[PDB]
Design a protein around this ligand. Structure first.
Ligand code: HEM
Length: 154
C-alpha cells in the first residue's frame, strides 16, 4: 500500500489540529473504544476496574496513557510510510506482552475516526477521512505482517 503525497497532506493537516489538544483527544479516543467495544477494556489490567464513563473521564492514569498512545501514533504518521523502525517495538510488545489481536487494532482505528469526525468536521470531510482510513489501514497491514514474523496470529 502506498499513500500519495496529497493523501498524506490531508492526514497531517487534521493531525496538526489534533496536536493542539493531545490529552483531550487521547482521552476521547480510549473512552470511545471502551464504550463501543467493552471487551477491549479487559486487555488492560490497569483500567479494567473502571465501571462507567464518568470513572473513565476522571482517571488521570487513563488520560496519561491516552497521551502515550496518541504520541506514538503521531510519530508513526509523521514518517509518511517510512515507519519500520517505529513499528518494531510496538509490534513486539503488543504481540508478545499485551496480546492484542488485529481485530482490536481495527476497533481502535474506528474510534479515532469517530472522534476526528466529531471534533473536526470542517477538516475531516469525505476525502480527508478516506486518507486517514488508508493511513491506518497501512499501519494495520504492516503491524499484521510483523505479528506474523514474531509468531503471533493476531
Ligand atoms: C493505535 C494503536 C495503538 C498504539 C499506537 C498503541 C501504543 C501503545 C504504547 C506506546 C504503549 C506503551 C509501550 C508498550 O507497551 O508498547 C502501549 C501499551 C499498551 N497497549 Fe497499546 N497501542 C495501540 C493499540 C492498543 C490496543 C487496541 C490495545 C488493546 C485493546 C492496546 C493495549 C495495550 C496495553 C494493555 C498496554 C499496556 C498498558 C499498561 O498497563 O501500562 N494497545 N500501547
Amino acid at each position: 500500500m502506498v499513500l500519495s503525497e496529497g493523501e498524506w497532506q490531508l492526514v497531517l493537516h487534521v493531525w496538526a489540529k489534533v496536536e493542539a489538544d493531545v490529552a483531550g483527544h487521547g482521552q476521547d479516543w480510549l473512552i470511545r473504544l471502551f464504550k463501543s467495544h467493552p471487551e477491549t477494556l479487559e486487555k488492560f489490567d490497569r483500567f479494567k476496574h473502571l465501571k462507567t464513563e464518568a470513572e473513565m473521564k476522571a482517571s488521570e492514569d487513563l488520560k496519561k496513557h491516552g497521551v502515550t498512545v496518541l504520541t506514538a501514533l503521531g510519530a508513526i504518521l509523521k514518517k509518511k510510510g517510512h515507519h519500520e523502525a517505529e513499528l518494531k517495538p510496538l509490534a513486539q510488545s503488543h504481540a508478545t506482552k499485551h496480546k492484542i489481536p488485529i481485530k482490536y487494532l481495527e476497533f481502535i482505528s474506528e474510534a479515532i475516526i469517530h472522534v476526528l469526525h466529531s471534533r473536526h468536521p470542517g477538516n475531516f470531510g469525505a476525502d480527508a477521512q478516506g486518507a486517514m482510513n488508508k493511513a491506518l489501514e497501512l499501519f494495520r497491514k504492516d503491524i499484521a505482517a510483523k505479528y506474523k514474523e514474531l509468531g503471533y496470529q493476531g
